[PDB]
Design an enzyme around this catalytic site. Structure first.
Site, short mmCIF file in Angstrom:
data_model
loop_
_atom_site.label_atom_id
_atom_site.label_comp_id
_atom_site.label_asym_id
_atom_site.label_seq_id
_atom_site.Cartn_x
_atom_site.Cartn_y
_atom_site.Cartn_z
N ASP A 150 -10.20 111.99 -48.99
CA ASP A 150 -9.01 112.41 -48.27
C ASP A 150 -8.70 111.47 -47.10
OD1 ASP A 150 -6.73 114.00 -47.69
OD2 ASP A 150 -7.86 115.74 -47.03
N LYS A 151 -7.54 111.70 -46.48
CA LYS A 151 -7.04 110.91 -45.36
C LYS A 151 -6.55 111.88 -44.31
CE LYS A 151 -2.78 109.68 -44.37
NZ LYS A 151 -1.76 110.27 -43.43
N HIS A 152 -6.76 111.53 -43.04
CA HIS A 152 -6.10 112.24 -41.95
C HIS A 152 -5.53 111.27 -40.96
CE1 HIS A 152 -4.96 115.64 -39.56
NE2 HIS A 152 -5.59 115.16 -38.47
N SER A 153 -4.39 111.62 -40.38
CA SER A 153 -3.73 110.81 -39.35
C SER A 153 -3.63 111.61 -38.06
CB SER A 153 -2.32 110.46 -39.82
OG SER A 153 -1.57 109.85 -38.78
N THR A 199 3.39 116.66 -42.30
CA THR A 199 3.48 116.54 -43.76
C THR A 199 3.91 117.85 -44.45
OG1 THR A 199 1.90 114.75 -43.71
CG2 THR A 199 2.20 115.89 -45.84
N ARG A 227 -6.74 125.44 -26.16
CA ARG A 227 -6.63 124.06 -25.67
C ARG A 227 -5.18 123.70 -25.36
NH1 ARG A 227 -8.60 120.80 -30.27
NH2 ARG A 227 -8.14 118.97 -28.96
N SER A 234 -12.25 119.34 -33.85
CA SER A 234 -11.12 120.06 -34.43
C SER A 234 -10.64 119.41 -35.73
CB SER A 234 -9.98 120.16 -33.41
OG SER A 234 -8.92 120.95 -33.90
N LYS A 282 -11.82 120.92 -40.02
CA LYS A 282 -10.90 121.17 -41.13
C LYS A 282 -11.12 120.20 -42.29
CE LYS A 282 -7.28 122.14 -37.80
NZ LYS A 282 -7.85 121.15 -36.85
N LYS A 283 -11.22 118.90 -42.02
CA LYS A 283 -11.36 117.95 -43.13
C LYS A 283 -12.72 118.10 -43.83
CE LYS A 283 -8.06 115.94 -43.92
NZ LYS A 283 -6.85 116.47 -44.63
N1 LIG Z 1 -5.38 111.90 -31.32
N2 LIG Z 1 -5.05 113.08 -31.03
N3 LIG Z 1 -4.73 114.28 -30.71
C1 LIG Z 1 -3.71 115.02 -31.43
C2 LIG Z 1 -4.48 115.77 -32.49
F1 LIG Z 1 -5.47 115.00 -33.00
C3 LIG Z 1 -5.03 116.98 -31.76
N4 LIG Z 1 -5.14 118.14 -32.65
C4 LIG Z 1 -4.11 118.48 -33.42
C5 LIG Z 1 -4.23 119.58 -34.26
C6 LIG Z 1 -5.41 120.30 -34.28
O1 LIG Z 1 -5.52 121.29 -35.04
N5 LIG Z 1 -6.43 119.94 -33.50
C7 LIG Z 1 -6.33 118.89 -32.69
O2 LIG Z 1 -7.29 118.57 -31.96
O3 LIG Z 1 -4.09 117.26 -30.72
C8 LIG Z 1 -3.30 116.10 -30.44
C9 LIG Z 1 -1.82 116.43 -30.55
O4 LIG Z 1 -1.46 116.57 -31.92
#
Ligand SMILES: N=[N+]=N[C@H]1[C@@H](F)[C@H](n2ccc(=O)[nH]c2=O)O[C@@H]1CO
Ligand SMILES: N=[N+]=N[C@H]1[C@@H](F)[C@H](n2ccc(=O)[nH]c2=O)O[C@@H]1CO
Lengths: 440, 440
Positions: B83-86, B123, B171, B186, B190-191
């Site tokens: 998988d990929k995350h951005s 997405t 947060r 965080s 999830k990933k």
């Molecule tokens: N890089 N960076 N930070 C972004 C993201 F990585 C972080 N973020 C988003 C969603 C989430 O569920 N948890 C979470 O920690 O918050 C920031 C605003 O989107």
């Protein structure tokens, strides 16, 4: 102006908050528009970054202004509005004598006090050992009592410094109690809402004290003195000893008994006397009822000697719906414990160390205090005849006399008392009861 | 083991938390026994004190373990789960092509993605411009789609990393989003709950990026790579550019259109191509589907060239209840805006600076994103034909084509685009699209 999260971020990143930002946040706490998470986050940023004097002042005034502030001018009293607050301790019963003594010297003392917290006793819980005593008179009745008697001791009503209610509740579950700016603001928001001319602060030092070191006790005292004087309330602080029980007793009914016997002159623990007198002297000088220490002491000793202080106490109890003959007949009103028995040390020697936090917790465990807010107090339990540091203990001098609600409870308390006290073959070095005075 | 407030205090005072303490706290978050104030307080102590690698690992694993973790072994697939995350951006549509490209090369991509946040697109919101597309298939249906198609893109269900739900919610109102350990935990909670063999992380750099500087983008990438590899998921990260829009479009339907045209070879923005390809290459190498960059690129280019990637995208859309003829007939399904009109710069020159955060916020303001969670998206609005840094703009090249829901909205968007972009008399210096690769 305006955003809660923006204000948290500003403080997080080490910037000072403006008066406007602080007032906005405190208002949001009061009107439940700022969440528990946001309160805790701000509290923690203050724990880390501290607050400057203008910030501390702003925080205190905002919290004071969040609810009702009393004003006494319109009663046209002929004396100063003056009060005392203590950080808390074990056997810290000074208010029960100090209020009546200062009232007998011409002061007016609208004392909003508190219940026990953690290991420390609470003046309101001690007073609730007196049958009928009402810590919640209505607003106009409170005013009547202050005018007529000169002193009353009451609880915080929902309308007094309401922002402090959620703020302290959040601090106490998030490890943000232990912050000088937060403590200062919390204490003074309530005391300054009394509409005072003068105030004395008793900051404890030692094993039974909240601040962990002498230097931090001192810093707290300095903050409180600075903020209160800035608000035009003439304020001083005494740093006083809590390395042992202050009175000869710890509990509720037992401490009320001690207060009455102190006022009538049957018995006066000398350390309790020294701290009580020193605090009263500050109140008379700051309230302009005396010009110096010698004059203040003479006046205070006079109202003890002539029975006037004891009379004011009796009148206060009667005004607050306790018995009209309480001073003379206290023994029939104050509840007696099921089992009263001395606890003796395991060895002979001098009382050398006494863990006053542990002693306070022993009283809680006996049922004389609460672990959760819903807990019910047994008003009869506690300690009397406390040994003092430097006392020789043996078969003829116990460590304490334990008042317990049944015999199982007694044994647990005896173990805890013995565990809290160390003996040595020599008496420990003397310590002052009053270490020092802090003024503007 | 055991107390929430004690754990907060320990971290407050600069001590490292044990795995046991961290797991207890994360469990308490999940089962609503630890309050919002306590979450915020802990978060703030982590903001101030940071976390060591063992703490970061413990936090990540506890959050992953707080709910359902997927396992793919029992389907006996013949390929890696990858998988990929951005971190997010503007025109950051890579996943819509990357999922199908890697699936066409023999990978299985159970992509749990997200909605838009702050200024960035999401997405899931882009996919919800496709009529019928279902981001919430049930567990067994999701498994069917992964087996049959090789990729699906879905939302986080209430049972996936549930501790992260309250943690992130807290947060985001307490200025504790901006913490590397908290972000790392965080993202990976999830990933890693996807049951991966391999992962690539796209951490953005620049004005449209979350981390404020290149060095902090880098530190975040390093943390994510370290934690994920420790969990036995072969992970790398690319630091990629977000100093302008990545695709030629920003929005929802417009970005889906761009993804389809990219897959069919009608049009490929070269920067979007470079980032998409680079991320896919990482996935093939880490997933052991290719041994080196040249082999990976050849395989990925082949599935573009032979139509297989576009076919996988079509099959994914159909499997997730979008139209069965979506690739060929997208123009009839994707909604058209009420007003589509180019915005021209006020002067001639080279595109020199583009505030990508401001561009992202312009799309939100147009109704293409949300300011509060209850906000409703207009799926048709946004930008296409984006000018790139170094483009000469004049009467024949607009800054962008704005798709708006009515004409009043269009004017506001045109002002915002013009305000976000600076022109100069010379083109700015080139920057790489991929700054660097971080591996274990
Ligand atoms: N890089 N960076 N930070 C972004 C993201 F990585 C972080 N973020 C988003 C969603 C989430 O569920 N948890 C979470 O920690 O918050 C920031 C605003 O989107
Ligand atoms: N010194 N000191 N701190 C003690 C006291 F000053 C402080 N405190 C109590 C009550 C309150 O309302 N606000 C408040 O701030 O918490 C500590 C525990 O009782």
């Amino acid at each position: 102006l305006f955003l809660a999260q923006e204000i948290i971020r500003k403080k997080r990143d080490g910037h000072a908050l403006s008066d406007e930002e602080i007032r906005f946040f405190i208002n949001g706490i009061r009107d439940n528009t700022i969440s528990e998470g946001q309160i805790a986050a701000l509290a923690m940023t203050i724990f880390f970054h501290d607050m400057t004097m203008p910030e501390r002042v702003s925080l205190t005034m905002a919290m004071r202004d969040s609810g009702t502030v009393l004003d006494w001018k319109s009663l046209h009293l002929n004396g100063p509005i003056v009060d005392k607050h203590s950080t808390g301790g074990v056997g810290d019963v000074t208010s029960l004598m100090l209020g009546p003594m200062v009232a007998a010297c011409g002061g007016y003392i609208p004392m909003i006090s508190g219940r026990g917290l953690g290991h420390t006793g609470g003046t309101l819980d001690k007073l609730e050992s007196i049958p009928g005593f009402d810590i919640f008179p209505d607003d106009n009745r409170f005013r009547e009592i202050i005018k007529d008697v000169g002193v009353a001791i009451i609880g915080q009503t929902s309308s007094l410094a309401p922002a402090d209610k959620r703020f302290y509740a959040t601090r106490d579950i998030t490890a943000t109690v232990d912050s000088i700016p937060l403590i200062t603001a919390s204490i003074l928001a309530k005391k300054l809402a009394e509409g005072l001319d003068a105030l004395v602060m008793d900051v404890k030092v030692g094993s039974g004290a909240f601040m962990p070191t002498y230097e931090l006790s001192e810093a707290l005292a300095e903050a409180i003195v600075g903020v209160a004087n800035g608000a035009g309330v003439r304020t001083t602080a005494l740093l006083t000893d809590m390395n042992q029980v202050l009175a000869s007793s710890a509990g509720n009914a037992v401490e009320v008994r001690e207060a009455v016997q102190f006022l009538t002159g049957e018995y006066r623990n000398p350390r309790l006397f020294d701290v009580t007198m020193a605090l009263c002297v500050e109140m008379l000088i700051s309230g302009k009822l005396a010009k110096d220490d010698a004059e203040a002491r003479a006046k205070l000793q006079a109202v003890l000697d002539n029975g006037k202080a004891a009379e004011v106490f009796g009148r206060m109890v009667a005004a607050q719906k306790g018995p009209t003959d309480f001073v003379e007949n206290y023994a029939k009103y104050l509840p007696t414990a099921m089992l009263t028995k001395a606890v003796y040390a395991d060895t002979e020697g001098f009382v050398s160390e006494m863990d006053t936090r542990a002693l306070g917790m022993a009283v809680v465990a006996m049922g004389g205090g609460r672990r959760q807010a819903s807990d019910t107090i047994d008003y009869s339990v506690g300690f009397t005849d406390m040994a003092r540091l430097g006392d020789q203990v043996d078969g003829q001098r116990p460590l304490a006399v334990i008042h317990a609600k049944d015999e199982n409870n007694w044994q647990e308390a005896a173990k805890a008392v013995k565990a809290a006290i160390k003996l040595a073959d020599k008496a420990p070095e003397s310590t002052p009861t009053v270490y020092r005075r802090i003024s503007e």
